[PDB]
Every structure is written in structure tokens, then in C-alpha cells.
């Protein structure tokens, strides 16, 4: 019935489960180097009984398929949102349909961490998809340009591929293009407005402001940051240092609430984007 509320309680139970799982790893590592110091790492009836006890506790591994369901909870925590999913595919299924359905989340695990070395190191290594998919995946590799060509013209000539268009294009950092691409649907705005600011023209960025603010009720977390970023850059080009402070402060109040996130969680070089627009703001 409940969604996030139920999931919070389930994650508290999974925190206790993780505590228990990590407990034995913390435990037996001490145990067997204590038994090795007593001349008998595993050469002891009690040591074997301890290993059997650990096996009994681990018997809540409980159908590694059920462990697959638990990984399928797909924790915001990337690390073991990998680990057991790793296990789920690692030795166990090697089954074409199981393998294919897992390949989806394997790419999402690489996306969770950030670094996508396995996009071509595992997915394209196993040739997941057709030639169209191969061409799209090839983009990050030293081939990115003509692929961008086609992946642009198709967007001209199926809107959901248009968002992928803007994403890859923007990913070539070529804001000086997307300013032109379709300046004359929603996910595209994050792409577009950024260029609309970055190129810096008091006339097109007026237009992007006009386009954004006309929307019903954005209510959305992404676009509002860049909107603040922009609606600052009317005053600077019109010389009112009072209000620019107000808008950039409101930029803080936004960035400091929603996009700002958990404490550490494995994220270092990918935080940059979020923190570095902040730096330049300053």
C-alpha cells in the first residue's frame, strides 16, 4: 500500500539486515586469525561449529533468487545495489532471458556509480542490441561525431529519441549548437536553457526565460536551478547589482535544499557539476 513510508521501514529492516551481514564478515575474520594464532585456523571442532553457525545465519541468504528480489529493491545506495545483483547474475543464471533482463539493470548499476566503463566493457562486449544500438553506444568512444550527425537528423527526422538527442549533444558540450537546434518535451528544457545561458546573448536568453516562465507549474526540481542561473543574467547586462544578489541567493536556497544530497555515498568527480556551477555562481 504505502510507497516511500513502507520503503523507509523496509530500509530500516534492511539496515539491520546489512548490519547482520557485515557483522559476520567483521567477526569471522577476527575469529579465524584468533584460531590460527592458537595453531588451528579450521583445525578445531569448535571452529567448524562456528563456521556452521555462520552458515546457518547466512542461510537467510534464502534462495539467492530471493536475494535477487532484494537487490531488485535497487538501493539508492549504489554499492550493494550492485553486490547481490552482481551475484544474481554472476554464476547463477547465465540464462539468455535472465541474462537479457538483467543486462538492463547492469547498465543502471554502472549508471548508479557514474563511471560507465562497462557500457562498452560489458554491454557492448556482449553486443547487447542491434546495429542501431551499437552506433548509439559507440558515441562515447573516439567515434562520436557522425553518430551525433545521424542522432541529430533523426531527432529532426519518435520524440523520446529527441530527448536522447539533446542529452548526447549537450554531452558534446556544444551549447553553441543546441542554442540553434530547436530554439524554435519537458526533459529537453534542462538541456536547452543551459546553453541559452552559457552562450550569453541578452536576446535569445530573454526568449528562453519567456518560454520557461510560461509553463503551467514546473514544480520540478531540475529546471528551476538553471532558471535562477539565467534570470540572474538580465540584471548583470542591465546593471542592477542589488537584485542580482537576490536571485543568486535564491539560487543558493534551491541548490541547498533539493539537489544537495546525502553525505558521501561514493560520489566524488560527479558531484563536480553540481558544486562547480555553485563555484562559478560565487
Amino acid at each position: 500500500g504505502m510507497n516511500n513510508l513502507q520503503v523507509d521501514s523496509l530500509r530500516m529492516c534492511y539496515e539491520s539486515i546489512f548490519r547482520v551481514f557485515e557483522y559476520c564478515k567483521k567477526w569471522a575474520t577476527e575469529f579465524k586469525q584468533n584460531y590460527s594464532k592458537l595453531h588451528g585456523t579450521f583445525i578445531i571442532k569448535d571452529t567448524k561449529t562456528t563456521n556452521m553457525l555462520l552458515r546457518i545465519d547466512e542461510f537467510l541468504r534464502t534462495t539467492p533468487s530471493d536475494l535477487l528480489a532484494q537487490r531488485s529493491l535497487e538501493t539508492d545506495s549504489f554499492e550493494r545495489s550492485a553486490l547481490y545483483l552482481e551475484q544474481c547474475y554472476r554464476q547463477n543464471p547465465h540464462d539468455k532471458n535472465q541474462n537479457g533482463q538483467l543486462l538492463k539493470n547492469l547498465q543502471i548499476t554502472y549508471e548508479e556509480i557514474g563511471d560507465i566503463d562497462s557500457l562498452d566493457g560489458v554491454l557492448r562486449t556482449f553486443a547487447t542490441g542491434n546495429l542501431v544500438s551499437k552506433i548509439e553506444e559507440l558515441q562515447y568512444s573516439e567515434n562520436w561525431k557522425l553518430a551525433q550527425d545521424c542522432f541529430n537528423v533523426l531527432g529532426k527526422f519518435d520524440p523520446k529519441t529527441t530527448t536522447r538527442m539533446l542529452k548526447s549533444m549537450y554531452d558534446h558540450q556544444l551549447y553553441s549548437q543546441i542554442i540553434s537546434n530547436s530554439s524554435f518535451v519537458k526533459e529537453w528544457y534542462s538541456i536547452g536553457l543551459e546553453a541559452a545561458n552559457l552562450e550569453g546573448n541578452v536576446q535569445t536568453l530573454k526568449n528562453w526565460v519567456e518560454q520557461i516562465e510560461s509553463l503551467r507549474n514546473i514544480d520540478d526540481r531540475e529546471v528551476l536551478l538553471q532558471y535562477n542561473i539565467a534570470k540572474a543574467l538580465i540584471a548583470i547586462s542591465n546593471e542592477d547589482p542589488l537584485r542580482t544578489q537576490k536571485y543568486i541567493h535564491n539560487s543558493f536556497r534551491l541548490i541547498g535544499t533539493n539537489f544537495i544530497t546525502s553525505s558521501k555515498e561514493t560520489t566524488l568527480l560527479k558531484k563536480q557539476n553540481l558544486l562547480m556551477k555553485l563555484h562559478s555562481l560565487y
Partner: peptide
């Protein structure tokens, strides 16, 4: 690694250097 670096916060903690 993976079992020696459990919770996986540890698995990557030295695994991004194992890479």
C-alpha cells in the same frame, strides 16, 4: 575483494583502485 570489502561501500573503496 567483494566479501573482504562488504557493504560494497568497501568493495568500491579499494575496488576503484583494484581497477
Amino acid at each position: 575483494f567483494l566479501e573482504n570489502f562488504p557493504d560494497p561501500i568497501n568493495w568500491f573503496n579499494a575496488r576503484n583502485t583494484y581497477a
